[PDB]
Design a binder for this molecule. Structure first.
Ligand SMILES: O=C(O)[C@H]1O[C@@H](O)[C@H](O)[C@@H](O)[C@@H]1O
Length: 378
C-alpha cells in the first residue's frame, strides 16, 4: 500500500484541478453547499461553507483561465442557480447571476466543461418547452460574458427525449453522445448516437467527417451503436477521448441472447465504431437500487481505466484495465476493499488530462466521509 491513497475531505450528505490546486464541492450534513480546495500532494483542505443551502441535489464547478471558480447547482429544477468566485482562487461566491438571461427559468442538470484558452462551455437541460432540451452556452474569457451557442442541438421532435454526456478533449474538440428515450419508462431507452465540434459548438460533425445540418434528430444522427428498447440500456453515463481525438463511451446493456447486462466500451478508431464487453458478469438485473453503477473512463492512447461498482464484487470501487482496447485482456481489480453501496463514480477530468493522475470522488452512498481516492495508473 505504497501508491494508492484514500484522502479524507469531510463528512457530507464534483472534483476539478486547476494548476496545483484541486477543488471540490459537496453538501454538508446541515445541507449547505461547501466549496473546498487543497494543494495537490497534500491532505489539508480549506473548506468554505457558502451562503447557499440545499434533479434533486446536483453541483457542477469549473475553473476558468483566469482562475475564477464558476458554480451551478440544481435543487428545485426551476431558475438557473449560477455564481462565480469573487476573485481568482477564492472559494467565496458572489450573488446568483444570469448567464444570457434567456431560457433560464427551468434548468436542471447543469454541467461545465473547459474550452481552449481558458473559456468555458455550459450545458443544461432546459424544461421551458415542457420537455427536456440540451441548451449550450460559452463563456468568453476575453469579454467576460456568456453567449448562447445552441438553442436546439438534439431534437426529439415531440416523439422522444435525449440523455446526453459530453467531453472536451485535449485538442479542444467537444464530443457529444446520447441515448434516446421514447416514453417515461426507462426500458424505452435505445441507441447510442454521436457528434463532435471543432469550433466551440458552432458546427457539428459525424465521426466520418460528414457535417450535420442542425438540429440532430433520430433520422440524421450518427449511430455509434444500434441498441433496441428493452436492452437494459442505461441513460446519462460518460464519455472520453484520447489525445488523437478518438471518442470512447462507457455504458452498459444486455445482448439479445443473454439475461445478464454487461459493461461496455464503445469507441471509434477514425474508421469505424467498435464495442467490447468489459467484465464477465453472471447476475441478471432489470431496470424495469440498480446493482451496478454508471461507469467512468480515462484513456491514454487506447489504454483504458474503466471505473465501476457492482454487487457481484461487493459494491467496492472497482476498475477494469486494458493496455489496448482493440486487443488486450481486461484486468479487473478493486480499488477499495469495502462497500460503497449505491456510489457512482466521478473523477477529476482535468487532472487526468493535464497530469495523467486518476483521482476519484469516493463516498459511501445510501453523514458519510467524502474521500479523494488517488489511484495508481502507471
Ligand atoms: O486550454 C484550456 O483552457 C483548456 O482547453 C481544453 O481544450 C482542454 O480540454 C482543457 O483541459 C484545457 O484546460
Amino acid at each position: 500500500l505504497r501508491q494508492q491513497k484514500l484522502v479524507e475531505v469531510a463528512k457530507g450528505y464534483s472534483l476539478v484541478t486547476h494548476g496545483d490546486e484541486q477543488y471540490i464541492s459537496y453538501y454538508d450534513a446541515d445541507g449547505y453547499l461547501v466549496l473546498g480546495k487543497r494543494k495537490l500532494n497534500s491532505k489539508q483542505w480549506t473548506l468554505h461553507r457558502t451562503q447557499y443551502r440545499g434533479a434533486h441535489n446536483i453541483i457542477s464547478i469549473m475553473v476558468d483561465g483566469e482562475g475564477y471558480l464558476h458554480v451551478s447547482f440544481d435543487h428545485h429544477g426551476h431558475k438557473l442557480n449560477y455564481c462565480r468566485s469573487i476573485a481568482p482562487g477564492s472559494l467565496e461566491l458572489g450573488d446568483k447571476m444570469p448567464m444570457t438571461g434567456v431560457d433560464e427559468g427551468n434548468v436542471t442538470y447543469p454541467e461545465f466543461y473547459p474550452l481552449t484558452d481558458g473559456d468555458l462551455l455550459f450545458v443544461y437541460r432546459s424544461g421551458s418547452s415542457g420537455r427536456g432540451n440540451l441548451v449550450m452556452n460559452r463563456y468568453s474569457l476575453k469579454d467576460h460574458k456568456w453567449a448562447r451557442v445552441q438553442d436546439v442541438l438534439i431534437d426529439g421532435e415531440d416523439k422522444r427525449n435525449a440523455y446526453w454526456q459530453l467531453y472536451v478533449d485535449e485538442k479542444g474538440t467537444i464530443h457529444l453522445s446520447w441515448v434516446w428515450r421514447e416514453t417515461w419508462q426507462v426500458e424505452t431507452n435505445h441507441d447510442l448516437c454521436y457528434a463532435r465540434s471543432f469550433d466551440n459548438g458552432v458546427t457539428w460533425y459525424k465521426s466520418d467527417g460528414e457535417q450535420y445540418k442542425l438540429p440532430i434528430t433520430a433520422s440524421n444522427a450518427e449511430y455509434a451503436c444500434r441498441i433496441p428498447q428493452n436492452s437494459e440500456l442505461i441513460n446519462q453515463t460518460s464519455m472520453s477521448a484520447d489525445a488523437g481525438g478518438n471518442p470512447y463511451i462507457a455504458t452498459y446493456w444486455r445482448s439479445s441472447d443473454s439475461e445478464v447486462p454487461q459493461y461496455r466500451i464503445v469507441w471509434n478508431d477514425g474508421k469505424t465504431w467498435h464495442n467490447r464487453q468489459v467484465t464477465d458478469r453472471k447476475t441478471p438485473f432489470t431496470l424495469k437500487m440498480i446493482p451496478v453503477a454508471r461507469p467512468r473512463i480515462v484513456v491514454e492512447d487506447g489504454e483504458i481505466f474503466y471505473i465501476f461498482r457492482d454487487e457481484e464484487r461487493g459494491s467496492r470501487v472497482s476498475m477494469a484495465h486494458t493496455a489496448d482496447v482493440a486487443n488486450g485482456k481486461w484486468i479487473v481489480t478493486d480499488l477499495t476493499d469495502f462497500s460503497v453501496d449505491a456510489w457512482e463514480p466521478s473523477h477529476d477530468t482535468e487532472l487526468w488530462k493535464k497530469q495523467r493522475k486518476l483521482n476519484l470522488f469516493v463516498q459511501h452512498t445510501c453523514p458519510q466521509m467524502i474521500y479523494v481516492l488517488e489511484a495508481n495508473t502507471n
